[PDB]
Ligand binder design. Structure first.
Ligand code: GDD
Ligand code: GDD
Ligand code: BMA
Ligand code: MG
Ligand code: MG
Lengths: 160, 160
Protein backbone atom coordinates (compact mmCIF):
# COMPACT_ATOMS: atom_id res chain seq x y z
CA UNK A 1 0.00 0.00 0.00
CA UNK A 2 1.01 3.70 -0.18
CA UNK A 3 -0.26 6.90 1.47
CA UNK A 4 1.54 9.62 -0.42
CA UNK A 5 3.10 12.81 0.93
CA UNK A 6 1.43 16.09 -0.15
CA UNK A 7 4.01 16.72 -2.91
CA UNK A 8 3.80 13.21 -4.39
CA UNK A 9 0.03 13.25 -4.07
CA UNK A 10 -0.15 16.60 -5.92
CA UNK A 11 1.86 15.18 -8.85
CA UNK A 12 -0.36 12.06 -9.00
CA UNK A 13 -3.68 14.00 -9.03
CA UNK A 14 -2.28 16.38 -11.65
CA UNK A 15 -0.81 13.57 -13.80
CA UNK A 16 -3.28 10.65 -13.83
CA UNK A 17 -6.74 9.26 -12.98
CA UNK A 18 -7.38 8.15 -9.41
CA UNK A 19 -9.41 5.05 -8.69
CA UNK A 20 -12.14 5.09 -6.06
CA UNK A 21 -14.97 3.02 -4.64
CA UNK A 22 -18.31 4.68 -3.97
CA UNK A 23 -20.85 3.29 -1.52
CA UNK A 24 -24.57 3.59 -2.21
CA UNK A 25 -25.73 2.74 1.30
CA UNK A 26 -29.39 2.08 2.12
CA UNK A 27 -30.87 1.85 5.63
CA UNK A 28 -33.96 -0.11 6.77
CA UNK A 29 -36.22 2.84 5.90
CA UNK A 30 -35.17 3.08 2.24
CA UNK A 31 -33.00 6.15 2.78
CA UNK A 32 -29.53 6.73 1.40
CA UNK A 33 -26.44 7.99 3.20
CA UNK A 34 -24.85 11.32 2.32
CA UNK A 35 -21.75 13.04 3.70
CA UNK A 36 -20.65 16.64 3.34
CA UNK A 37 -17.49 17.75 1.56
CA UNK A 38 -16.01 20.68 3.47
CA UNK A 39 -12.62 20.62 1.67
CA UNK A 40 -11.73 20.82 -2.02
CA UNK A 41 -12.31 19.39 -4.55
CA UNK A 42 -15.94 20.54 -4.96
CA UNK A 43 -16.43 21.82 -1.38
CA UNK A 44 -19.99 22.72 -0.35
CA UNK A 45 -21.76 19.58 -1.59
CA UNK A 46 -23.20 16.35 -0.19
CA UNK A 47 -21.75 13.07 -1.59
CA UNK A 48 -22.31 9.36 -1.07
CA UNK A 49 -19.38 7.96 0.94
CA UNK A 50 -16.26 6.57 -0.73
CA UNK A 51 -12.51 6.69 -1.10
CA UNK A 52 -9.35 6.12 -3.09
CA UNK A 53 -7.56 2.80 -3.85
CA UNK A 54 -3.81 2.89 -3.05
CA UNK A 55 -0.79 1.50 -4.92
CA UNK A 56 -0.57 -2.32 -4.73
CA UNK A 57 -3.86 -2.55 -2.81
CA UNK A 58 -6.40 -5.09 -4.11
CA UNK A 59 -10.02 -3.99 -4.65
CA UNK A 60 -11.05 -6.62 -2.08
CA UNK A 61 -8.74 -5.17 0.57
CA UNK A 62 -9.70 -1.59 -0.39
CA UNK A 63 -13.41 -2.38 0.06
CA UNK A 64 -12.82 -3.59 3.65
CA UNK A 65 -10.55 -0.67 4.58
CA UNK A 66 -12.85 1.94 2.98
CA UNK A 67 -16.18 0.69 4.33
CA UNK A 68 -14.57 0.73 7.78
CA UNK A 69 -13.10 4.22 7.23
CA UNK A 70 -16.20 5.79 5.67
CA UNK A 71 -19.00 4.00 7.51
CA UNK A 72 -17.45 2.72 10.75
CA UNK A 73 -18.25 -0.83 9.67
CA UNK A 74 -15.85 -3.31 8.04
CA UNK A 75 -17.60 -5.10 5.18
CA UNK A 76 -16.27 -7.61 2.61
CA UNK A 77 -16.62 -6.90 -1.15
CA UNK A 78 -19.13 -9.80 -1.42
CA UNK A 79 -21.50 -7.68 0.69
CA UNK A 80 -21.83 -5.07 -2.09
CA UNK A 81 -23.66 -5.41 -5.39
CA UNK A 82 -21.42 -3.98 -8.12
CA UNK A 83 -22.97 -0.86 -9.61
CA UNK A 84 -20.94 0.08 -12.68
CA UNK A 85 -17.82 2.00 -13.62
CA UNK A 86 -18.34 5.77 -13.28
CA UNK A 87 -16.15 8.81 -13.97
CA UNK A 88 -15.80 11.91 -11.78
CA UNK A 89 -14.14 15.09 -13.04
CA UNK A 90 -13.55 18.15 -10.84
CA UNK A 91 -12.22 21.63 -11.69
CA UNK A 92 -10.01 21.77 -8.57
CA UNK A 93 -8.04 19.54 -6.25
CA UNK A 94 -7.42 18.97 -2.51
CA UNK A 95 -4.69 21.67 -2.57
CA UNK A 96 -6.39 24.46 -4.56
CA UNK A 97 -7.38 25.60 -8.04
CA UNK A 98 -4.15 24.99 -10.00
CA UNK A 99 -5.18 21.62 -11.55
CA UNK A 100 -8.11 19.23 -12.02
CA UNK A 101 -9.06 15.97 -10.28
CA UNK A 102 -10.09 12.85 -12.22
CA UNK A 103 -11.57 9.66 -10.64
CA UNK A 104 -12.41 6.34 -12.27
CA UNK A 105 -15.03 4.99 -9.86
CA UNK A 106 -16.39 1.57 -8.94
CA UNK A 107 -19.86 1.85 -7.37
CA UNK A 108 -21.35 -0.67 -4.92
CA UNK A 109 -24.86 -0.93 -3.46
CA UNK A 110 -25.74 -2.48 -0.11
CA UNK A 111 -27.96 -2.20 2.95
CA UNK A 112 -26.88 -1.48 6.53
CA UNK A 113 -28.49 -0.87 9.89
CA UNK A 114 -27.97 2.72 11.09
CA UNK A 115 -27.05 1.50 14.59
CA UNK A 116 -24.02 -0.52 13.36
CA UNK A 117 -22.24 2.51 11.83
CA UNK A 118 -19.68 3.35 14.52
CA UNK A 119 -18.27 6.78 13.67
CA UNK A 120 -16.65 9.35 16.00
CA UNK A 121 -19.37 11.22 17.92
CA UNK A 122 -18.37 14.72 16.77
CA UNK A 123 -18.82 13.62 13.13
CA UNK A 124 -22.48 12.63 13.47
CA UNK A 125 -23.72 15.91 11.92
CA UNK A 126 -21.50 15.35 8.86
CA UNK A 127 -24.04 12.80 7.59
CA UNK A 128 -27.74 12.58 6.83
CA UNK A 129 -30.15 10.08 5.29
CA UNK A 130 -32.49 10.89 2.41
CA UNK A 131 -34.84 8.90 0.22
CA UNK A 132 -34.04 8.85 -3.49
CA UNK A 133 -36.76 11.41 -4.35
CA UNK A 134 -35.60 13.75 -1.56
CA UNK A 135 -31.93 13.51 -2.55
CA UNK A 136 -32.88 14.24 -6.19
CA UNK A 137 -34.88 17.31 -5.03
CA UNK A 138 -31.98 18.74 -2.98
CA UNK A 139 -29.90 21.67 -4.35
CA UNK A 140 -27.00 20.42 -2.36
CA UNK A 141 -26.28 16.92 -3.59
CA UNK A 142 -23.50 16.88 -6.18
CA UNK A 143 -24.25 15.72 -9.72
CA UNK A 144 -21.81 12.78 -9.30
CA UNK A 145 -24.01 11.46 -6.49
CA UNK A 146 -27.40 12.35 -8.05
CA UNK A 147 -26.17 10.23 -11.00
CA UNK A 148 -26.53 6.90 -9.17
CA UNK A 149 -30.27 7.57 -8.79
CA UNK A 150 -31.09 8.66 -12.36
CA UNK A 151 -32.01 6.05 -15.00
CA UNK A 152 -30.90 8.49 -17.72
CA UNK A 153 -27.36 8.49 -16.24
CA UNK A 154 -27.10 4.69 -15.92
CA UNK A 155 -27.17 4.54 -19.75
CA UNK A 156 -23.83 3.30 -21.12
CA UNK A 157 -22.14 2.76 -17.75
CA UNK A 158 -19.91 -0.34 -18.03
CA UNK A 159 -21.37 -2.99 -15.69
CA UNK A 160 -24.99 -1.74 -15.68
CA UNK B 1 -5.02 13.77 -23.83
CA UNK B 2 -2.06 13.91 -21.43
CA UNK B 3 1.03 11.87 -22.26
CA UNK B 4 3.54 12.18 -19.43
CA UNK B 5 7.29 12.86 -19.45
CA UNK B 6 9.50 9.97 -18.26
CA UNK B 7 10.01 11.48 -14.77
CA UNK B 8 6.31 12.18 -14.12
CA UNK B 9 5.29 8.75 -15.43
CA UNK B 10 7.88 7.05 -13.21
CA UNK B 11 6.42 8.90 -10.19
CA UNK B 12 2.86 7.89 -11.14
CA UNK B 13 3.71 4.20 -11.70
CA UNK B 14 5.63 4.13 -8.41
CA UNK B 15 2.85 5.92 -6.48
CA UNK B 16 -0.61 4.86 -7.68
CA UNK B 17 -2.69 2.33 -9.68
CA UNK B 18 -2.87 2.86 -13.44
CA UNK B 19 -6.18 2.41 -15.27
CA UNK B 20 -6.21 0.38 -18.47
CA UNK B 21 -8.55 -1.13 -21.05
CA UNK B 22 -7.97 -4.70 -22.24
CA UNK B 23 -9.31 -6.03 -25.55
CA UNK B 24 -10.36 -9.68 -25.85
CA UNK B 25 -10.45 -9.85 -29.63
CA UNK B 26 -11.88 -12.86 -31.47
CA UNK B 27 -11.55 -13.59 -35.21
CA UNK B 28 -13.95 -15.67 -37.36
CA UNK B 29 -12.02 -18.90 -36.57
CA UNK B 30 -12.64 -18.44 -32.81
CA UNK B 31 -8.97 -17.50 -32.23
CA UNK B 32 -7.83 -14.68 -29.89
CA UNK B 33 -5.23 -11.97 -30.49
CA UNK B 34 -2.07 -11.99 -28.41
CA UNK B 35 0.91 -9.64 -28.61
CA UNK B 36 4.49 -10.16 -27.52
CA UNK B 37 5.65 -7.93 -24.73
CA UNK B 38 8.98 -6.43 -25.94
CA UNK B 39 9.77 -4.17 -22.97
CA UNK B 40 9.35 -4.17 -19.18
CA UNK B 41 7.26 -5.03 -17.22
CA UNK B 42 6.88 -8.82 -17.68
CA UNK B 43 9.05 -8.82 -20.81
CA UNK B 44 8.84 -11.92 -23.06
CA UNK B 45 5.25 -12.80 -22.15
CA UNK B 46 2.23 -12.72 -24.46
CA UNK B 47 -0.79 -10.51 -23.58
CA UNK B 48 -4.13 -9.54 -25.08
CA UNK B 49 -3.86 -5.96 -26.45
CA UNK B 50 -4.62 -2.90 -24.28
CA UNK B 51 -3.44 0.42 -22.85
CA UNK B 52 -3.86 2.99 -20.09
CA UNK B 53 -6.38 5.81 -19.65
CA UNK B 54 -4.72 9.23 -19.45
CA UNK B 55 -5.52 12.12 -17.10
CA UNK B 56 -8.89 13.79 -17.95
CA UNK B 57 -9.64 11.26 -20.71
CA UNK B 58 -13.11 9.67 -20.73
CA UNK B 59 -13.41 5.87 -21.02
CA UNK B 60 -15.26 6.58 -24.29
CA UNK B 61 -12.34 8.51 -25.83
CA UNK B 62 -9.68 6.17 -24.43
CA UNK B 63 -11.43 3.19 -26.07
CA UNK B 64 -11.32 4.89 -29.51
CA UNK B 65 -7.71 6.03 -29.16
CA UNK B 66 -6.57 2.66 -27.84
CA UNK B 67 -8.40 0.45 -30.36
CA UNK B 68 -6.78 2.49 -33.16
CA UNK B 69 -3.34 2.49 -31.47
CA UNK B 70 -3.43 -1.23 -30.60
CA UNK B 71 -5.45 -2.76 -33.44
CA UNK B 72 -5.33 -0.21 -36.30
CA UNK B 73 -9.11 -0.07 -36.18
CA UNK B 74 -11.03 2.79 -34.55
CA UNK B 75 -13.99 1.36 -32.61
CA UNK B 76 -16.42 3.02 -30.20
CA UNK B 77 -16.91 1.66 -26.64
CA UNK B 78 -20.42 0.47 -27.63
CA UNK B 79 -18.79 -2.09 -29.94
CA UNK B 80 -17.32 -3.85 -26.89
CA UNK B 81 -18.93 -6.22 -24.42
CA UNK B 82 -17.83 -5.09 -20.96
CA UNK B 83 -16.04 -8.05 -19.38
CA UNK B 84 -15.41 -7.05 -15.76
CA UNK B 85 -12.91 -5.12 -13.65
CA UNK B 86 -9.56 -6.93 -13.27
CA UNK B 87 -6.32 -6.30 -11.38
CA UNK B 88 -2.79 -6.67 -12.82
CA UNK B 89 0.33 -6.64 -10.62
CA UNK B 90 3.89 -6.78 -11.98
CA UNK B 91 7.11 -7.00 -9.93
CA UNK B 92 8.98 -4.58 -12.21
CA UNK B 93 8.15 -1.45 -14.24
CA UNK B 94 8.78 0.21 -17.66
CA UNK B 95 12.03 1.76 -16.33
CA UNK B 96 13.57 -1.17 -14.45
CA UNK B 97 13.31 -3.06 -11.16
CA UNK B 98 13.05 -0.29 -8.50
CA UNK B 99 9.26 -0.50 -8.07
CA UNK B 100 6.13 -2.47 -8.99
CA UNK B 101 3.38 -1.78 -11.56
CA UNK B 102 -0.35 -1.91 -10.69
CA UNK B 103 -3.27 -1.77 -13.20
CA UNK B 104 -7.01 -1.61 -12.50
CA UNK B 105 -8.33 -3.07 -15.75
CA UNK B 106 -11.58 -2.77 -17.69
CA UNK B 107 -11.93 -5.79 -19.97
CA UNK B 108 -13.89 -5.64 -23.22
CA UNK B 109 -14.77 -8.56 -25.48
CA UNK B 110 -15.46 -8.20 -29.23
CA UNK B 111 -15.37 -9.87 -32.65
CA UNK B 112 -13.35 -8.62 -35.66
CA UNK B 113 -12.17 -9.52 -39.19
CA UNK B 114 -8.50 -10.53 -38.91
CA UNK B 115 -8.15 -8.93 -42.37
CA UNK B 116 -8.97 -5.39 -41.18
CA UNK B 117 -6.37 -5.07 -38.39
CA UNK B 118 -2.99 -3.34 -38.77
CA UNK B 119 -0.58 -6.21 -38.11
CA UNK B 120 2.95 -7.02 -39.40
CA UNK B 121 4.22 -10.19 -41.19
CA UNK B 122 3.55 -13.44 -39.33
CA UNK B 123 7.24 -14.23 -39.89
CA UNK B 124 8.21 -11.55 -37.33
CA UNK B 125 6.06 -13.49 -34.79
CA UNK B 126 5.18 -10.46 -32.64
CA UNK B 127 1.43 -11.29 -32.78
CA UNK B 128 -0.41 -14.63 -32.67
CA UNK B 129 -4.00 -15.81 -33.00
CA UNK B 130 -4.68 -18.68 -30.57
CA UNK B 131 -7.78 -20.63 -29.52
CA UNK B 132 -8.64 -20.46 -25.82
CA UNK B 133 -7.64 -24.15 -25.44
CA UNK B 134 -4.20 -23.48 -26.90
CA UNK B 135 -3.42 -20.29 -24.93
CA UNK B 136 -4.60 -21.81 -21.63
CA UNK B 137 -1.96 -24.57 -22.03
CA UNK B 138 0.78 -22.02 -22.80
CA UNK B 139 2.92 -20.87 -19.82
CA UNK B 140 4.13 -18.44 -22.49
CA UNK B 141 0.90 -16.50 -22.16
CA UNK B 142 0.77 -14.34 -19.03
CA UNK B 143 -1.51 -15.36 -16.15
CA UNK B 144 -3.34 -12.02 -16.47
CA UNK B 145 -4.37 -12.98 -20.02
CA UNK B 146 -5.13 -16.67 -19.36
CA UNK B 147 -7.42 -15.41 -16.52
CA UNK B 148 -9.98 -14.06 -19.03
CA UNK B 149 -10.55 -17.61 -20.29
CA UNK B 150 -10.69 -19.37 -16.89
CA UNK B 151 -14.06 -19.87 -15.16
CA UNK B 152 -12.40 -20.07 -11.73
CA UNK B 153 -10.76 -16.64 -12.26
CA UNK B 154 -14.04 -15.11 -13.50
CA UNK B 155 -15.51 -15.60 -9.99
CA UNK B 156 -15.47 -12.50 -7.77
CA UNK B 157 -14.72 -10.11 -10.65
CA UNK B 158 -16.92 -6.98 -10.43
CA UNK B 159 -19.10 -6.87 -13.55
CA UNK B 160 -18.93 -10.64 -14.16
N1 GDD C 1 -1.54 13.30 1.26
C1 GDD C 1 -2.37 12.37 0.75
N2 GDD C 1 -3.71 12.58 0.78
C2 GDD C 1 -4.56 11.66 0.28
C3 GDD C 1 -4.07 10.48 -0.27
N3 GDD C 1 -5.14 9.76 -0.68
C4 GDD C 1 -6.26 10.47 -0.40
N4 GDD C 1 -5.90 11.64 0.19
C5 GDD C 1 -6.79 12.72 0.67
O1 GDD C 1 -7.39 12.30 1.90
C6 GDD C 1 -8.79 12.59 1.94
C7 GDD C 1 -9.59 11.29 2.03
O2 GDD C 1 -9.72 10.81 0.70
P1 GDD C 1 -10.43 9.41 0.31
O3 GDD C 1 -11.62 9.17 1.23
O4 GDD C 1 -9.38 8.35 0.17
O5 GDD C 1 -10.91 9.80 -1.19
P2 GDD C 1 -11.90 11.04 -1.50
O6 GDD C 1 -11.07 12.17 -2.02
O7 GDD C 1 -12.84 11.27 -0.33
O8 GDD C 1 -12.76 10.47 -2.73
C8 GDD C 1 -14.15 10.24 -2.58
O9 GDD C 1 -14.85 11.48 -2.73
C9 GDD C 1 -14.96 12.04 -4.06
C10 GDD C 1 -15.94 13.20 -4.01
O10 GDD C 1 -15.33 14.28 -3.30
C11 GDD C 1 -15.49 11.02 -5.06
O11 GDD C 1 -15.49 11.59 -6.38
C12 GDD C 1 -14.68 9.73 -5.00
O12 GDD C 1 -15.27 8.78 -5.89
C13 GDD C 1 -14.64 9.18 -3.57
O13 GDD C 1 -15.95 8.79 -3.14
C14 GDD C 1 -9.11 13.30 0.64
O14 GDD C 1 -9.18 14.71 0.88
C15 GDD C 1 -7.95 13.00 -0.28
O15 GDD C 1 -7.69 14.10 -1.16
C16 GDD C 1 -2.69 10.26 -0.29
O16 GDD C 1 -2.19 9.20 -0.76
N5 GDD C 1 -1.88 11.21 0.21
N1 GDD D 1 6.52 8.15 -20.66
C1 GDD D 1 5.25 7.66 -20.68
N2 GDD D 1 5.04 6.38 -21.06
C2 GDD D 1 3.78 5.89 -21.09
C3 GDD D 1 2.70 6.67 -20.73
N3 GDD D 1 1.58 5.92 -20.85
C4 GDD D 1 1.97 4.70 -21.28
N4 GDD D 1 3.30 4.69 -21.42
C5 GDD D 1 4.18 3.59 -21.89
O1 GDD D 1 3.91 3.38 -23.28
C6 GDD D 1 3.81 1.99 -23.60
C7 GDD D 1 2.39 1.64 -24.04
O2 GDD D 1 1.48 1.95 -22.98
P1 GDD D 1 -0.06 1.51 -23.08
O3 GDD D 1 -0.26 0.71 -24.34
O4 GDD D 1 -0.90 2.72 -22.82
O5 GDD D 1 -0.22 0.55 -21.79
P2 GDD D 1 0.49 -0.88 -21.70
O6 GDD D 1 1.71 -0.70 -20.85
O7 GDD D 1 0.53 -1.47 -23.10
O8 GDD D 1 -0.56 -1.75 -20.82
C8 GDD D 1 -1.11 -2.95 -21.35
O9 GDD D 1 -0.22 -4.04 -21.05
C9 GDD D 1 -0.19 -4.50 -19.68
C10 GDD D 1 0.70 -5.73 -19.59
O10 GDD D 1 2.00 -5.38 -20.06
C11 GDD D 1 -1.59 -4.83 -19.15
O11 GDD D 1 -1.55 -5.23 -17.76
C12 GDD D 1 -2.50 -3.62 -19.34
O12 GDD D 1 -3.81 -3.91 -18.85
C13 GDD D 1 -2.52 -3.21 -20.83
O13 GDD D 1 -3.12 -4.25 -21.63
C14 GDD D 1 4.18 1.26 -22.32
O14 GDD D 1 5.56 0.89 -22.39
C15 GDD D 1 3.97 2.26 -21.20
O15 GDD D 1 4.99 2.09 -20.22
C16 GDD D 1 2.93 7.98 -20.34
O16 GDD D 1 1.97 8.72 -20.01
N5 GDD D 1 4.20 8.45 -20.32
O1 BMA E 1 5.13 -1.33 -20.95
C1 BMA E 1 4.09 -2.03 -21.64
C2 BMA E 1 4.40 -2.05 -23.14
O2 BMA E 1 5.78 -2.33 -23.34
C3 BMA E 1 6.16 -2.20 -24.71
C4 BMA E 1 5.42 -3.24 -25.54
O3 BMA E 1 5.86 -4.55 -25.17
C5 BMA E 1 3.91 -3.15 -25.34
O4 BMA E 1 3.27 -4.28 -25.94
C6 BMA E 1 3.56 -3.09 -23.86
O5 BMA E 1 2.17 -2.78 -23.71
MG1 MG F 1 -13.74 9.60 1.46
MG1 MG G 1 -0.47 -1.33 -25.05
Amino acid sequence: MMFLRQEDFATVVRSTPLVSLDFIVENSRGEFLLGKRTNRPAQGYWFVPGGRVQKDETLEAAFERLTMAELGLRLPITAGQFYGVWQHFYDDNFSGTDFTTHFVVLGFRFRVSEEELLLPDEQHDDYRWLTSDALLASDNVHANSRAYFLAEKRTGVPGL
